[PDB]
Amino acid sequence: KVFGRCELAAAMKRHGLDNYRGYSLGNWVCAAKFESNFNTQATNRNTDGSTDYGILQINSRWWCNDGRTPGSRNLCNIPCSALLSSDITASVNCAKKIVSDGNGMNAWVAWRNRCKGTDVQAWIRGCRL
Template sequence: MPSTTNLNRTLATLLLVVLVTATSLFTGTSAKVFTKCELAKELGKNGISRTFYGHWICLANAESGLNTTKVTKLANMSASYGIFQINSKEWCREGRKGGKCNMKCEDFINDNITDDIEC
C-alpha cells in the first residue's frame, strides 16, 4: 500500500494536471513550440539585446524544449511554468497574483511570452 505522503503527492500532481488542462480549455490557451528563430524575434520585439539571445534561447530550450505550455511539478511542491519554467515558489503564485513578478503562474502557459520575458 502506498504511503500517505506518496498518495498526497500523486493526488496533488493529478489535481495540477486537471487544473492546467481546464485552464487551457477555458482560457483558449494554445500550445506553441517556438523555433529558435521565432524566439529570437520575440525577444527582439520585447527589447532584449541581441547580445543575450543565445542565453535566453539556450535557457528556454533546456528548460521547456521551447514549449510555452510546459508545466513541471517539483518535489518541493512548487511547479515551474512556461517556456522559461518560471517557478511558483518565488516568482509567481498558483491561482492568484503574487511572487516577485506579481503574476499568476498560469499566465505563463500560453503562446504570448511577453509577460514571461518581463518576469
C-alpha cells in the same frame, strides 16, 4: 505554442532580452530550449511542491501564484497560468526581474549546466534579426 528557434529569438529581441543585464540573445534561446523545449505550455513540479511554468520554467515558490504553493511568493505579481500563454510577454517581463535579482541567469539550472560557457551565439545563427 511550440516556438521555432528563430521565431523565439525574434520575439525575445522584440521584448528587449538581447544583452539584457549583459546576456546576449543566444543565452535566452539556449535556456528556453533546455528548460521547456520552446514549449510555452511546459510545466514541471519540483520537490518542495512548487511548480515551474512556461517557456522559461519560472518557479511558483517565488515568482508567480498558482494557488497551491503554500508560503510562497508572487514577485512578478501574476498567475502562473499567464506564463503558459502563446504570448511570451509575461514570461519575458518576469524573467527580467529574475535575472536582475543578483544571481543572473544562474537562476536557471539548465542554463548553468548546458548553456553557460558554450557557444551560445550558435542558437541564433541563421536567424533573420
